[PDB]
Amino acid sequence: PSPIEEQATRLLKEVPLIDGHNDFPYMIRGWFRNDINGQDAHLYDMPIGQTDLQRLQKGLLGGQFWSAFVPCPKNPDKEVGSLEALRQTLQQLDVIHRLIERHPTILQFADSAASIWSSFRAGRVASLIGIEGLHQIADSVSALRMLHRLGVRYVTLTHNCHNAFADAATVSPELHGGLSRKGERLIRELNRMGMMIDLSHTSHEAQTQALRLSRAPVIYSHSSIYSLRAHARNVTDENLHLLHRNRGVVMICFLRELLASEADQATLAHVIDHIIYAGTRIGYEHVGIGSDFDGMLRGPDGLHDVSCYPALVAGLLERGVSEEDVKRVMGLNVIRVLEEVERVAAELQGAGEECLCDELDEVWNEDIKEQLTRERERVRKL
Amino acid sequence: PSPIEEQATRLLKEVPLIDGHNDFPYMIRGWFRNDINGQDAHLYDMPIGQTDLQRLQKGLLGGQFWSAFVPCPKNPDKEVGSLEALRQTLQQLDVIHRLIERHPTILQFADSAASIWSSFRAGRVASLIGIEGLHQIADSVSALRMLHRLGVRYVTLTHNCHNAFADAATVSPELHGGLSRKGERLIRELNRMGMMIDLSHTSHEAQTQALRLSRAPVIYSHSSIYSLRAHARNVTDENLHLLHRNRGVVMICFLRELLASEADQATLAHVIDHIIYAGTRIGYEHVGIGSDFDGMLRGPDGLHDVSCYPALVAGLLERGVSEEDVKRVMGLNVIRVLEEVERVAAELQGAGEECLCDELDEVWNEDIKEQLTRERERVRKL
Numbered sequence: 001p002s003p004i005e006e007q008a009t010r011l012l013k014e015v016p017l018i019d020g021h022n023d024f025p026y027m028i029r030g031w032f033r034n035d036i037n038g039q040d041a042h043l044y045d046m047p048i049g050q051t052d053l054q055r056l057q058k059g060l061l062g063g064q065f066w067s068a069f070v071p072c073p074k075n076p077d078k079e080v081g082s083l084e085a086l087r088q089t090l091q092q093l094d095v096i097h098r099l100i101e102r103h104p105t106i107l108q109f110a111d112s113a114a115s116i117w118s119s120f121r122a123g124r125v126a127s128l129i130g131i132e133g134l135h136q137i138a139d140s141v142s143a144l145r146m147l148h149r150l151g152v153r154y155v156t157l158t159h160n161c162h163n164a165f166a167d168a169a170t171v172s173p174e175l176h177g178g179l180s181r182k183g184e185r186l187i188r189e190l191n192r193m194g195m196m197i198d199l200s201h202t203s204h205e206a207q208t209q210a211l212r213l214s215r216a217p218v219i220y221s222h223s224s225i226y227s228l229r230a231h232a233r234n235v236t237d238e239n240l241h242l243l244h245r246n247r248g249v250v251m252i253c254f255l256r257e258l259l260a261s262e263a264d265q266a267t268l269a270h271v272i273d274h275i276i277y278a279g280t281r282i283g284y285e286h287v288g289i290g291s292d293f294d295g296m297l298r299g300p301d302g303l304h305d306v307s308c309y310p311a312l313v314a315g316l317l318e319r320g321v322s323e324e325d326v327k328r329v330m331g332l333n334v335i336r337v338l339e340e341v342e343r344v345a346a347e348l349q350g351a352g353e354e355c356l357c358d359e360l361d362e363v364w365n366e367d368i369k370e371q372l373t374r375e376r377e378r379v380r381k382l
Numbered sequence: 383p384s385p386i387e388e389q390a391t392r393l394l395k396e397v398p399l400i401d402g403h404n405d406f407p408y409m410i411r412g413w414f415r416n417d418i419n420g421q422d423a424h425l426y427d428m429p430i431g432q433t434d435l436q437r438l439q440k441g442l443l444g445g446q447f448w449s450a451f452v453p454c455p456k457n458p459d460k461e462v463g464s465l466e467a468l469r470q471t472l473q474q475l476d477v478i479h480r481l482i483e484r485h486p487t488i489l490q491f492a493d494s495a496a497s498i499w500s501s502f503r504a505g506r507v508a509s510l511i512g513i514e515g516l517h518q519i520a521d522s523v524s525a526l527r528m529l530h531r532l533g534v535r536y537v538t539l540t541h542n543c544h545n546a547f548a549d550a551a552t553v554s555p556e557l558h559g560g561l562s563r564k565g566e567r568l569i570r571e572l573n574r575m576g577m578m579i580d581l582s583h584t585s586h587e588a589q590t591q592a593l594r595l596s597r598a599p600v601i602y603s604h605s606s607i608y609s610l611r612a613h614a615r616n617v618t619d620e621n622l623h624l625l626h627r628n629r630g631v632v633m634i635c636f637l638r639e640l641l642a643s644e645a646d647q648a649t650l651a652h653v654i655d656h657i658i659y660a661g662t663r664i665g666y667e668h669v670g671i672g673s674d675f676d677g678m679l680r681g682p683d684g685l686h687d688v689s690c691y692p693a694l695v696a697g698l699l700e701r702g703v704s705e706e707d708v709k710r711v712m713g714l715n716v717i718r719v720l721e722e723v724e725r726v727a728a729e730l731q732g733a734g735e736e737c738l739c740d741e742l743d744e745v746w747n748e749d750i751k752e753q754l755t756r757e758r759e760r761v762r763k764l
């Protein structure tokens with residue numbers, strides 16, 4: 001009805017709004033235990049949470065990085081907890097693929113810039129996947145490459161747990177003091193394979209080191225601004241500048257604790273303040289939208305669920321952000337980063353760069369290796 | 383030079399010889415520990431084993447189901463062993479994909495009848511994948527569906543270990559006495575997802591039950607004939623007949639213990655005896671070739687390595703098997719089974735059959751579920 005609301009609706013049909021982070025797959029594990037057979041009525045109209053398939057259509061969302069999050073392992077035996085997390089990751093990747101496959105009119109799987117656009121041309125929500133923590137890979141780079149093959153296109157280096165590769169923000173004391181030696185080596189492998197690095201949930205020092213080391217642009221899938229609201233999860237002015245040099249994107253989070261000192265005061269206007277702050281200081285080509293819907297109980301006033309994206313687009317236009325810059329913040333920026341991550345990987349794989357391999361145990365003793373070599377030479381005689 | 387050898391060479395160029403089972407990926411884990419960077423000289427000319435990339439070309443093999451085998455878990459803590467086997471499976475799937483990707487002139491990945499042919503048109507060895515035992519999935523059907531997504535197109539129900547789903551042949555006493563209740567339910571899921579059932583390594587009673595229950599044709603990826611040589615790993619006349627009704631294929635194994643009472647007496651002629659026995663009694667459209675190269679130290683006389691396939695094709699022609707029947711045994715039969723497995727899955731998935739889901743723990747108590755429902759109704763008021 002309002003000229004501003006007609007303008008927002010047009011932009012949402014012109015370009016895809018691609019949200020950086022949504023934990024709807026974990027809601028499905030909590031509520032249904034990943035059994036969605038005969039649950040369409042509930043999947044379209046959920047009795048819990050901030051995401052369902054009717055409200056997803058209503059908000060005119062163009063794409064989504066669906067989170068394949070599993071919790072940090074709590075088993076006192078650490079080997080078992082890490083391996084347990086790997087199995088749970090495959091369960092969450094499985095229910096995401098089944099959610100997409102059982103609802104092809106609404107959701108379409110995407111793992112690239114081209115597949116995002118083709119999904120958007122067809123009127124589907126481009127359904128991408130990200131894992132949230134390197135605890136999920138069970139210390140296995142082979143497993144990580146297989147997760148890329150299953151459709152994972154970003155890896156948050158940590159969640160609320162330290163791992164062998166990096167320091168999380170919310171846990172103290174520090175383990176590695178930024179990235180470990182392994183972490184630095186993993187950055188090279190992530191760039192080589194074409195996996196997008198996500199720096200949300202990681203410590204400020206780990207961000208600084210990763211932003212300097214990475215040969216491809218990175219993202220913050222759901223982080224806000226430190227200068228406006230001081231929090232371990234928000235991005236400092238230092239790391240915002242290094243993100244600019246990196247050519248990355250900060251996808252602004254709707255978490256109330258990241259927007260206001262008192263959480264119940266958080267609003268849609270605060271999310272817009274954070275987008276404008278970043279856009280003013282490091283350009284609107286390096287800012288995105290990273291809701292974290294279903295990673296919280298309650299959202300800000302005016303951003304209560306996935307139906308509220310038109311109010312965000314209208315609010316940005318109302319504050320004097322240009323149409324072209326709003327389109328950038330909506331999704332063009334995160335598409336560009338994914339495109340550049342793929343382009344860097346094709347360059348490095350084309351040059352024949354050596355991949356990172358896991359440390360494996362010897363399965364043969366010297367007696368078995370002697371039998372095999374002696375057998376080979378017998379065949380050479382024939 | 384011989385008219386028979388010219389004829390064999392022509393057949394190998396006309397249609398792909400598709401071998402049912404090769405453990406070359408496990409040799410790579412044993413010898414290189416899955417680190418193949420800068421090892422091309424050795425990968426083309428191996429110091430051990432019955433498979434390398436030069437001899438693979440020399441034998442004119444058209445396709446191969448590469449084994450992603452890992453050993454049966456030996457940890458006394460069974461939960462840990464099962465989870466360890468899952469991680470090792472991802473390591474072996476990873477090195478198979480890296481082997482194919484680093485040598486695109488020789489190997490090309492295939493996961494269907496169409497992708498086998500296109501690989502063969504381009505002069506590549508069609509590189510398919512199979513896992514060898516349901517111990518590899520860590521009791522997770524979600525993981526199994528993700529293995530299908532990673533390119534696994536058959537699952538041997540057991541190796542030399544009993545699992546929760548089926549009885550292996552070589553271990554006694556019997557656990558389930560054929561298939562377990564879970565096993566019967568897994569047969570339905572394997573048919574639905576389009577995973578080819580492999581009955582090698584399983585007990586005679588488990589074969590009988592699976593052959594009656596399966597809605598799609600199955601294979602024996604590497605098994606020989608019981609009537610010619612009595613062994614727990616060979617196929618009985620009863621199960622050969624039920625394989626005929628199933629429309630499946632028995633892919634004849636080169637294992638010396640399966641061909642002769644004294645292993646050192648085993649020959650190429652014995653492999654041909656077994657192919658002709660099966661072809662005579664259940665038709666040549668239900669017989670294949672399933673070497674098990676690199677699952678043994680030494681092969682039969684005349685079938686010492688992957689370069690020896692032209693001698694097998696020539697030997698079949700020399701014994702009066704027709705060109706069309708030799709082409710069937712070479713690969714047309716196993717292509718047909720994979721085509722029919724895919725066709726059955728498309729039918730059942732098109733009809734919207736419900737998939738088998740894992741038993742998951744509750745992650746939310748009633749207090750958290752109340753908070754979520756109360757929160758949802760607050761949003762409905764707005």
Ligand SMILES: [Ca+2]
Pocket residue numbers: 023292295
């Ligand atoms: Ca979260």
Ligand SMILES: [Ca+2]
Pocket residue numbers: 294295296297
């Ligand atoms: Ca929650």
Ligand SMILES: [Ca+2]
Pocket residue numbers: 405674677
């Ligand atoms: Ca074997």
Ligand SMILES: [Ca+2]
Pocket residue numbers: 676677678679
């Ligand atoms: Ca061996």
Ligand SMILES: [Mg+2]
Pocket residue numbers: 237238240241281
């Ligand atoms: Mg700055």
Ligand SMILES: [Mg+2]
Pocket residue numbers: 619620622623663
């Ligand atoms: Mg019979």
